[model samples]
Target: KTISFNFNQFHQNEEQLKLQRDARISSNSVLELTKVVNGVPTWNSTGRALYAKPVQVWDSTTGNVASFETRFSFSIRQPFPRPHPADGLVFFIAPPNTQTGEGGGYFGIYNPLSPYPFVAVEFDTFRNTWDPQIPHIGIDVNSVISTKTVPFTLDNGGIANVVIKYDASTKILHVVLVFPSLGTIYTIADIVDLKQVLPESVNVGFSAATGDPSGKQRNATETHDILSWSFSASLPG
Candidate 1:
């Protein structure tokens, strides 16, 4: 079976019903894309958040698997006079669960058990010990230590877009990042086996976390906004 979905956050009304019913929002996350600003839903914010939605991964009778593609736009904002941003976010697939990880470089997607053989594409701002010294995009499998990475950064108070596709036959995960402000595009890919890594069905969504003022440098106020999102699935070739 093939499943497809499209979402325009700015126009969501009853459409939220689908997500609200099948999705699990943990911590500070919400379905709202942009918060009301000046009586308008102009800007949105998230401190530490996690959202997960269930998806069909394979057919029972036919044993046919699914290939999926997802596209979304997001932005990271930092308040002025702050030392630096504390953490960042990730798009991930894991077993169905509402529990999220601790903040402060964890990206709110990892935990002590590291439950679930998860795969993630991270947009990280802060560098942990294993991470590169600068903001980067990384592919994490099972563990937070990314097997592959590339340097990436965003302009303060700017928005960027991303697209990810997984081909079941080739087992390739392709990623594209577009920065309209900088007029740059980044593309990357990695090979993965979904059946071996994840269960028959999995949860998909985004997670973000911030640092504690006393733990890291003085905590900086930050916001993550997802202006739009879309996902589609098809029978594997």
Candidate 2:
């Protein structure tokens, strides 16, 4: 009926899985998703942290998706503040076997070349040609080009609290991101049919990327860390 984990904090040895390049549990047990090379973030670095077990998202016989919601606290910033951080983070639901993808603008969900099947709520900072260039929240389905998006302003400190919810009956995916330091709240929603994309049972987690794809600003460094997380789902009966 419900699945939740480490509601307040994450342990050094939790059942969560860190995959691809540079995702690991830090000394403080933070889920740091990105890397540092020679004391600087490497170019095109990417990583993902996923719950170890699969979640039953839908029943095979009924083909109806479960209502779900997740709350996570994260900080994306440089130890020394810069103009803006390269790229941003995502909360996503993918196939249980989903692996980390390309770095830079791809945000570790879409792979080597083929964009996989998945649904995600992205908190975007860096803008590609497909994006609006302003910091925004988007509902991404299958591709990096979001199906629904709303502009949001992220200033000062680079930390925020995010809550993503999905209703099975309404097929609406909603998100609430609050920046406590700045007293800002962003609410956005879109209709998403998970049964049309993801499998019956799937893995839900967080992913992030750092660096410049053109190899121009490989010297820059940014930190994208998941401080804590809790997820729960109630399947339609």
Candidate 3:
């Protein structure tokens, strides 16, 4: 599928905004949703959680999964580093039009009800489970963190960007990370078909968390925002 809507248009405010993410979902009745008008668009998820409204979708076997491709771009501003559970964003694909995940402090929008589906492509800041100090990218299948790549240099609080390609045809995930602070852009990691591994048609979106236990003075996880997105998908077969 080719992208129908790009981030060409934006709806931003002092705190958050939303853009029309390219195409729409053409799936079955039990699980399907068109774009919700007043949905969970996008926001600067600093000390809170960021969620995307439900969109209709399907996986490989059921539909010509290759046709369902999602592409979006996000920018992160490092206003102030937080205390503990750093900050990051997630992308999810579940059963057509289902609910998104419930995650916190690095776990994207991981759903507590469903454990296996908790797959996510994370742009993480701050060291946590399955990671040490140093900014970098990581992929978590069902909330189980993988080894971290090289973390990006921090500018105390600056702007950075990331893009991801989830190809159902190859059933692989390709991640691109760019650190404007260091002026670098490259592929960081690759994981096989996340849907196959997790085995669920999913809702897609992003979520962030700032775990400042003990109310320790958070380094202040900057703006922690999801700037915009661009996506496209083909009709189900």
Candidate 4:
């Protein structure tokens, strides 16, 4: 089946784009990721939260296996005078009916009990005790330990555009990050087989979290916004 979706805005109250609101672990007033201000949607409003599409995309039972591409633009900002931003965001494909992970260094992507059989590209801003003390992009599998990583920064809480594509036939996952102001592009790639790691069907979405100010961690208060998003089940020929 051919699957595609695009969202320039949340269009709140619209039933067509049913996004599953998962904020059980979120420590804020609003649980889900549907906060809008002046006609703009913030994925997570300066707190710990996670959001995912309500429906499953494609599974092993589905035709053509698993191949898809997604593009989105987002911004990350935190209060000034803080030494560093606590955490960042992640684009992930995980089992359906999942909740947000523990916040802080996890980026809301990993849960200690069920951190397996999934794929995620993390835009990490803060450095945990085990993490390098710098911003970087990492590709993760069942664990937070990165299979591959490269140094990258938000550069003063700037907006970022990203594209993630996975080809089932070639078994490769590629990621591209773009900075509009600097006109710079950073790319990374990895070889992974979803059939081996994930379940038959999976859900896709973004997760973010914040932490208390201490040591290297500054203000956890930050805004993560999804300006635009597009997805397709087929890869470009």
Best by lDDT: 2
> Residue by residue across 44-96, what tens digits does model 2's lDDT show?
77888888888888887876679988988887666444544677789888987
Model 2 off-target regions past 4 Å? 37-42, 79-84, 219-221
lDDT at position 58, candidate 3: 46
Write model 1 residue lDDT over 22-89, tens digit each, in one string.
12222333333222233222111222222334676665566666799999888776663356665666
In candidate 1, how many Å is residue 86 off?
1.9
| Model 1 segments more than 4 A misplaced | 10-53, 59-63, 80-82
Backbone collisions counted per model: 0, 0, 23, 0
The stretch of ten residues in a row with the least summed lDDT in candidate 4 is 22-31
TM-scores for all predictions: 0.79, 0.90, 0.64, 0.78
Q: Write the per-residue lDDT of candidate 4 for residues 50-159, one digit (tens) a residue.
A: 23443344454443455888998877665443555556667778887776665667766677887645688888777777676457888888766779888875645577
Cα error of candidate 3 at position 157, Å: 4.5
**Global lDDT of each candidate:** 0.65, 0.79, 0.46, 0.64
Model 4 misses residue 191 by how many Å?
0.7
Error of 3 at 97 (Å): 6.6
Worst 10 residues of 2 by lDDT: 76-85
TM-score, ranked from best to worst: 2, 1, 4, 3
